[PDB]
Amino acid sequence: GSSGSSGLEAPRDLEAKEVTPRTALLTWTEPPVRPAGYLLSFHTPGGQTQEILLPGGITSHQLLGLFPSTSYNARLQAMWGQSLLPPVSTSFTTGGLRISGPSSG
C-alpha cells in the first residue's frame, strides 16, 4: 500500500507564542510516540535558510537572531525509522523595536 501513516503520528497544535522583535517562542503538541530526533528549519522570505538539530524531547524551542517586523517560516520534522513524517509549517511575524517603559517601577 502507498506510503501512509502506519499508526505513527505527527506534531500538532503548532502556533507562534511570545512573539517579539528580539525572539520568538514556538509551542507544539508532541505525539504519543516520541520521535528519534527533531529537525527545526527556519528561513526568511527572500533570504537564506538555517537548520537546527533539536535535542529531541521538547515541546517548544527558543529561536535567536531574528529581525524586527520580519516574517519567518518554521518547520517541525521528526526523524522516524527510515521515514520522515510530514512536518508542520507555520508563519509568524515579529514585533517592532519599540520600548516605552522597560523599568516598570
Swiss-Prot record:
Residues 10-99 form the Fibronectin type-III domain. Highly expressed in fetal adrenal, in fetal testis, fetal smooth, striated and cardiac muscle. Isoform XB-short is only expressed in the adrenal gland. It is found in: Secreted, Extracellular space, Extracellular matrix. Belongs to the tenascin family. Appears to mediate interactions between cells and the extracellular matrix. Substrate-adhesion molecule that appears to inhibit cell migration. Accelerates collagen fibril formation. May play a role in supporting the growth of epithelial tumors. Homotrimer. Interacts with type I, III and V collagens and tropoelastin via its 29th fibronectin type-III domain. It is linked to Ehlers-Danlos syndrome, classic-like, 1: A form of Ehlers-Danlos syndrome, a group of connective tissue disorders characterized by skin hyperextensibility, articular hypermobility, and tissue fragility. EDSCLL1 patients lack atrophic scars, a major diagnostic criteria for classic Ehlers-Danlos syndrome. Delayed wound healing is only present in a subset of patients. EDSCLL1 inheritance is autosomal recessive. This is Tenascin-X. It comes from Homo sapiens. The gene is TNXB. The chain holds residues 3933 to 4024 of 4244 of the full protein.
